[model samples]
Target: NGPSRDVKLTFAQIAPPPGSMVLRGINPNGSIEFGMRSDEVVTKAMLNLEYTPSPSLLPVQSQLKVYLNDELMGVLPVTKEQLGKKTLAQMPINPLFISDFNRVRLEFVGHYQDVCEKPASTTLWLDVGRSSGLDLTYQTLNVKNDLSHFPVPFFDPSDNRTNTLPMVFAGAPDVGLQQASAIVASWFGSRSGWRGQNFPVLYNQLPDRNAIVFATNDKRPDFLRDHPAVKAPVIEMINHPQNPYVKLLVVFGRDDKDLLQAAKGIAQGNILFRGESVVVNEVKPLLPRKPYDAPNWVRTDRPVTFGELKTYEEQLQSSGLEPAAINVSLNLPPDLYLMRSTGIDMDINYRYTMPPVKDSSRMDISLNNQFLQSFNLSSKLDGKTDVSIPALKLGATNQLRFDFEYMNPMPGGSVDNCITFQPVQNHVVIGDDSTIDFSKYYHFIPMPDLRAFANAGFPFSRMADLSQTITVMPKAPNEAQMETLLNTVGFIGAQTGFPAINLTVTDDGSTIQGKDADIMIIGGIPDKLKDDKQIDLLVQATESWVKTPGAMAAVIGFQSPYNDQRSVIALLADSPRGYEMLNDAVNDSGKRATMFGSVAVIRESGINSLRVGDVYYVGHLPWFERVWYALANHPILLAVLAAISVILLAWVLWRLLRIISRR
Candidate 1:
């Protein structure tokens, strides 16, 4: 017998991750999808479905059918007294249907007594209770001492949910070790992606949780002292001293530098990691990445084929009323000013068995949930079609969905009888030749669009690799300073879905001079970065209302020593209060959609960004083209240029006529 843990999952957690918790329909059919992963073997699984029927429902021949995937699990007969009150129907799930991803569906079949009653009778309704849930009890799976499992015992991707991992640092607090910890934590955050993560940092104490221990040969804790360190990176996965059910990852190194390398290697070298105890002799340095150049995103500069479009592929059943839909996500610059001609051109290829009629089968396209166009697939077995979106309602992120609605008119277009067959060939493929054309508009919104910053580290992280970004801390940063910096970095990794590349950390402000790089400066009020040129410029740009010397303040300004294109965001705090306020400012910025200006004054009360600054344009633009951008943006200047062009055209025409007469 093994220790077992019981998990109860509510319907809110069972529904599609990106969808709603409530399920409602008349004679309805809806699915609840969820993902689960466990290192333990499940011994038993039970589903406790709770639902309430409409008060007006006529209980005649009413039944609620429950299915796990496609197999019928159980059914509950509806009765008159069951209405207006919650009821529970318990069923044991066949463990075979429980996999990495599971789908549970409820099909309701109800009818009113009168045969002549309207098909859409108000009394016909089945509402699944959000409190309905599944319970699973499992025995602890044996832990293998293998590095191949790596993030498995702790961080399983199949879990598809938020997780908290406790991080332990050995001995006294050191900035170098802090940096190493931050790097490791950020890797986990990146791996977690949008699922969310929290790493509680602890010093010199082990907690009863899935934890990671960071230490070096000379600076390890009492427990790790017996485990000798190596010249290269040494990683070991061992059973937790307190609990066998939990595992601990030990990152051991010769010194702080080697320790940092060890963490970095684990973060970036997932492909190379394996087995329980492994030695990393070396790690390849990561090259810097360019701005807005994410490997997972579609290239915006050139036309890309639809086949190159990376998204979830939808497979439609040949004999079902269920529509096939594919979600295509596009990432673009936060400040991409769209023009009339900016749109996506697509060549869609689809195959289907002979439909009952042409008018019955069609595909609808929608961008950001707004209907775009619908194409009729009427008698065609397979063919290619062109779709041109005149304009894209774009944002920092966009979702374009293609819904394939196939109708068969042969059987009176009855949805009830459509589930005859499912053919593998019934599919639609967006060809690789499709392209998106974006107009070249050169302009950037003013400083501190927190949403963009939280989403992609805008302006500063424009170069996805962060090669041109430098973090400036006080000469001797304290624990809070290091924590704040690391938290910011981890947040960026979470937003970008990857660890930042080639980011430079420095305490010497002099290095910032004349460098065309975005600088993130963190320190105490004024004195910490007072001598720095970038800080000086920001202080000068700071409006009087935001310049309380002892009050906490975070200011984002542009007056780079090299040029205006480079920006510097300074998080200056007077004390711990200021630091907390600074964090609040960041949190506030991320949640609210507000215009952030050159300076934001954060105090004990709240955050305020009252002072605005001139919007600067960044990107490749020649002198003449820059002039055109400026002129075109100003209607009066464009009109004046048009008049001058006409005059020059008339003069040229007169000169050409005189020359012709002379000839």
Candidate 2:
């Protein structure tokens, strides 16, 4: 009975196996797509998909293709193993670009090999960052990324003296940069001003070098902000045709826009033909309205048509953003082809405005004092020089022409008059995630080479003037570089925890050798010498040291009030005569630096001192002669007094001991 019952189930279920065992392959585990709306971005996307896999089985394969509208982005391939493990497929969104709504699309398709499996997960969607919104920032001149190097004259080894002329060459790479340095030293050794020779051999290195004179029109004025001699060259060198010939080679237009602008301007005005400077026949594709946030990162700055405008505006609105300004970006090449010798003719025509009768009613936007200043019509037009319109007032589109007759006299052809705008006042732009603020500092920075050599040490000048061209605006905020600058001028404290010396430089009407020496005071004492005893003495003493000989200057800057406990006083030379002088002035001695002030001591240079901040008053001044006397005389007086007191004490002690024994 058991055998019979078993035989009914035993045949191993061999129920007439079908001839063709057809098996179906499951769809890929998953499929996806990605894309961006605006500037090639990878954030927003539209995704669609279908799956064919059983809930119990792992997805067999995943395939994907991304797109932006109809433009295909890329394809992604996945395997069955990924289906089971990947609970959520994610695409990394790029942070650099901001896109429109659903501007990107992603597609996914899935499959399974087993019959029991069924596709469950299909098209999944994801968002990257909170974008698609308007962002505004202060406009800047930083438009591109390039190596930060400029052209500066170096002594030519081949020729030093007779050929002291400097040349600036362009085009560069890291390894080729040193060619400039070598030329400078080379020119100095053989050709430039040196103790060795009248003139050296000329290597004709300029063909391979790029350079800009230390002091030239290319520099920006803001570089010397707050410094009295804003645009003066620090090291003044007379132009001598016979001097050494040196040249500088920089990545002329590759990295810095300030240099590019100045160079282009110079080139346009300097290149001369038949006594005429080259004129920029209608600038390419009219400049676009720049974006406030990134003026340098403009898109296609070509002229916009009515249709394009509506399209752009509509895209912004649909993306929940407002249209602001247009931005322009330029990609310059690292080649010398852009640079060449040119000449320019500057012709000025003034629409003079006479002084008007005083009347507030005439204060209409274009009728008042601004109108006069704007028109280059000054009430006190000395009539010494011809009058011209103020470049600042004439609408940015206004054009000035140079007569071809004068072009031969000017070096460099017709100068480029590229127009850019500055805000009437600084502005601040706050976005959903970022904030931008603008300030007059925009005008503070000058074009390029002119800004260097003006300051005593030109501390910030090193980075700013490494090349012939510098940035009118920093590409990005540099907190560390700023801190370094503040510290150098004693505006901030250094290692000693004591603030550095700061000096306030003022225009002190004085000059030597036809060059004016800007007046500087150790403290912020008024130029009008004080009548009070203490301040008078201090002023007299400080002036004495400064007027003595060469300039020995130190700067002091402080962030906190340094009046009470800490004092930064000048140390004087120790001598007998100097001591007597100081003693005479001691009755009125006061602190050299006020609590929150600065000081600069220059030896014998024009104006030797300046102090910055609230506590700018100098309480003491260390006169060179007076200091020497005080040190020598005070120690002698103290020693004499000490000896006499010691003798008296000894006598009193002896008498006391004798009296005690008798009692």
Which candidate should be chosen as best, given lDDT against the real structure?
1
lDDT, candidate 2, 240-285, per-residue tens? 2232322222222222323323333332222232221122222122
Worst 10 residues of 1 by lDDT: 541-550
Task: List where candidate 2 sits over 4 angstroms from the true fold.
Answer: 1-70, 83-663
User: Tens digit of lDDT per residue, candidate 1, span 1-663?
Assistant: 657768776653345646434434322566666666657666787887777777765675778777877789677787778776787788887777665666887777765654343443455655556557678786777776666866887888876556877777675655466566766766776777656665555667787777888778875766775664477777888777766767888888777688877777777778867656777777776555555665444446655655445643442222244444666666665655444354555655656556544555667778878888786766546577677776543334667777776533443235554333222224445544455554344534544344456555665556554566776666655546755665677666665656764566765666666666776666754434542244335556433312221554565554454565666566666676656555545543253345345555554554455544455655554667556546656998788889999999999999999999999
Full-model lDDT, candidate 2: 0.26
Best by TM-score: 1
Q: Give RMSD to native, each candidate.
A: 6.1, 31.7
